[PDB]
Amino acid sequence: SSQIRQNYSTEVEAAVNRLVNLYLRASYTYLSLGFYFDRDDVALEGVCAFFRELAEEKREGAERLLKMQNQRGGRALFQDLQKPSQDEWGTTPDAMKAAIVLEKSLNQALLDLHALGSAQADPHLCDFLESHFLDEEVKLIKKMGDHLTNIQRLVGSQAGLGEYLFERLTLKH
Amino acid sequence: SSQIRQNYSTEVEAAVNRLVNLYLRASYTYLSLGFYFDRDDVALEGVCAFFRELAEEKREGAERLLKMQNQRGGRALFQDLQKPSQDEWGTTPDAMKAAIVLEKSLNQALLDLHALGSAQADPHLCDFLESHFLDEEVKLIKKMGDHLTNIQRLVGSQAGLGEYLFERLTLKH
Amino acid sequence: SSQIRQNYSTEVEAAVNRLVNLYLRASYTYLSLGFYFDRDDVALEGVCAFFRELAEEKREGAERLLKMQNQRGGRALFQDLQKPSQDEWGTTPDAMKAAIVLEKSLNQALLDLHALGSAQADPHLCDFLESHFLDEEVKLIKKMGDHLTNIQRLVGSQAGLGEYLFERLTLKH
Amino acid sequence: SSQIRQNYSTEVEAAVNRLVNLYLRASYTYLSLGFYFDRDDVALEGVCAFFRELAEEKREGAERLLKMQNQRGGRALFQDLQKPSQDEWGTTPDAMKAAIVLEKSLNQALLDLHALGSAQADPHLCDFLESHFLDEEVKLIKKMGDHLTNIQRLVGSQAGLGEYLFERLTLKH
Ligand SMILES: [Pd+2]
Ligand SMILES: [Pd+2]
Ligand SMILES: [Pd+2]
Ligand SMILES: [Pd+2]
């Protein structure tokens, strides 16, 4: 039961639960991406760290959604988390491309939920999504696009050398 | 080309470019206002500093817009910047009135863009505009209105004395 | 009016106003160069920062000229600012070449004004120009020439790799 | 005798001695202006301090000239110092006007000496004059013009009140 729920539709409640699943799926995907780059036959630690950081960011996003669900008086419902789409992630550009596709899918899910919020006249939801999610997605996708452009520029010259240089000079910290 | 653009209409992209032009025009206008008050035959340094600060604020606004344009995958297009509407700006109340007219025009441009964002279901744009621009405009216009009221109150008593006192006791820092 | 003007010709006054326009035009050009390198499909942040810094330097130069105009009792007159000569700036060497052409044009304008100062026996003007402008131009043009030589050396080997390495190892800070 | 003199004309040597006399005369004038404003029937201490500071600046200028005379191997020759042109200096605008006339006369003397330096191909002299004298004069005359404009603006409203306010709010430190 709840004694606090106000202006919070069942449609939004369900969409928030689905979004939590998407964010946790994304986190899982990034966990797989990170460890792939830590394989001794891949060995690009800056790339491992980049994706591991994203895994943490996506988990944090799911937790923020869940906190908000409870703040509004909605009820968390969890579903199975599907395994990531690949077991091996190819080259650095392959991985960065996959990451952009993933982020665009999350961004579209956020946009869809914001639209539902608007249709349901739920300004708390719509603002929650922008502050913690929509601006972060735009910034993140720009960073990934910039990364992809740099790695593409590098591997068009020399693939092995380019991947090493990108990891050493852009990613490693 | 872009590999990041998502939910960013050509209409909004063009409107953002036009807004950059308006902000740069405003910056240019404030540069002219500031130096007019630094003329040896005007010599009101607090007024010079007030308008110079605004010139910097408007330039910063244009830069923020341009950064956002690139974040969204839009493409900056610059146009000629028209010279300010006057070469000489009259009395302090004349100048403050001109400044209010200018800010109201920027504010209306922001409102128009927010409306376009709403019509295009672009919540990232609409929120970007409020956070960095719409609240700043409201605060700035209130300050200018307060200034205009004070200078009008002063120059209704004694024009020369009133302009000096306003610059010394309200503006100078 | 002015009560301070002394040994300040109308010819120099007009030339200073034209120089302000040239410096503001240059600033605008550098703003465009900087944001071009921040495009997600270009993504060379060290180059973005290099040109943005120059945009600020040129704006500062215009402001110094304007302050001097008022110090001498001349009157600032502003004209339209033409848009930069290109919308897209090509490769890093293309951009650095454009920048050198631009600086050489400013340098020539400064030399022309110094010559006018000499012809008008205006030592305050001639010294003002050397201290704040002429030595800065020489230093800046040497830096740009050095940059161009380095990027040319790099892209003659491998274009993509060379542009990345230059941005990472010379420009980025 | 001298064992160091090189490229230092007798014409420049004599002109430097005359300039020392002019600077000392100016210092004396400012001493008189300062004490006039300290009269119990005038009693404008910010004005006293303003002119006393100028008296010190002009004395310092004479000393710099004398040091340079000896550096070049010229020989200091002192003449009688004429008393200031007035015993009483009238109102604050009267005094500021007198001060501007005085500074313009020094500035013209500096310009005349720079021209002589140029005619004698004496670059050390010409540069000495710009660095320590010509830029200082331009700055000082702009400040005085700004002051005169402010006091005129004030006394056009109310003479007694305006003079008090200027001394309290612009000059006093
Ligand atoms: Pd909303
Ligand atoms: Pd909105
Ligand atoms: Pd010269
Ligand atoms: Pd010279």
Note down, in words, how this protein is organized.
- This is part of a larger assembly, with 4 copies of chain A (173 residues).
- Chain A is mostly helical.
- Chain A has one domain: Ferritin, CATH 1.20.1260.10.
- Chain A is 76% helix and 0% strand.
- Chain A has helices spanning 10-37, 45-72, 92-119, 123-157, 159-171.
- In chain A, helix 1 (10-37) packs antiparallel against helix 3 (92-119), helix 3 (92-119) packs antiparallel against helix 4 and helix 4 crosses helix 5 (159-171).
- Chain A is elongated.
- Chain A starts with 9 loop residues before the first helix and ends with a helix.
- Chains in contact: A-B, A-C, B-C, B-D, C-D.
- Chain B binds chain C through residues 1-4, 24, 28, 31-32, 35-36, 38-41, 59, 63, 66-67, 69-70, 73, 75-84, 87, and chain C through 1-4, 24, 28, 31-32, 35-36, 38-41, 59, 63, 66-67, 69-70, 73, 75-84, 87.
- Bound molecules: palladium ion (4 copies).
- One palladium ion (PD) binds at residues 118, 123, 126 of chain C.
- One palladium ion (PD) is lined by residues 118, 123, 126 of chain A.
Entry keywords:
part of a larger assembly; 4 chains; 173 residues; mainly alpha; Ferritin; binds palladium ion
CATH topology of chain A: Ferritin
Assembly form of the protein: part of a larger assembly
Total number of beta strands of chain A = 0
Cα shape of chain A:
elongated
- Each distinct ligand: palladium ion
Query: How many strands, which pairing sense, and closed or not: the largest β-sheet of chain A?
Result: none
Number of domains of chain A: 1
Give the SSE string of chain A: HHHHH
Estimate what percentage of residues of chain A fall within beta strands: under 5%
Biggest interface goes to: B-C, 32 and 32 residues
Output the structural class of chain A. mainly alpha
User: How much helicity do the residues of chain A have?
Assistant: over 70%
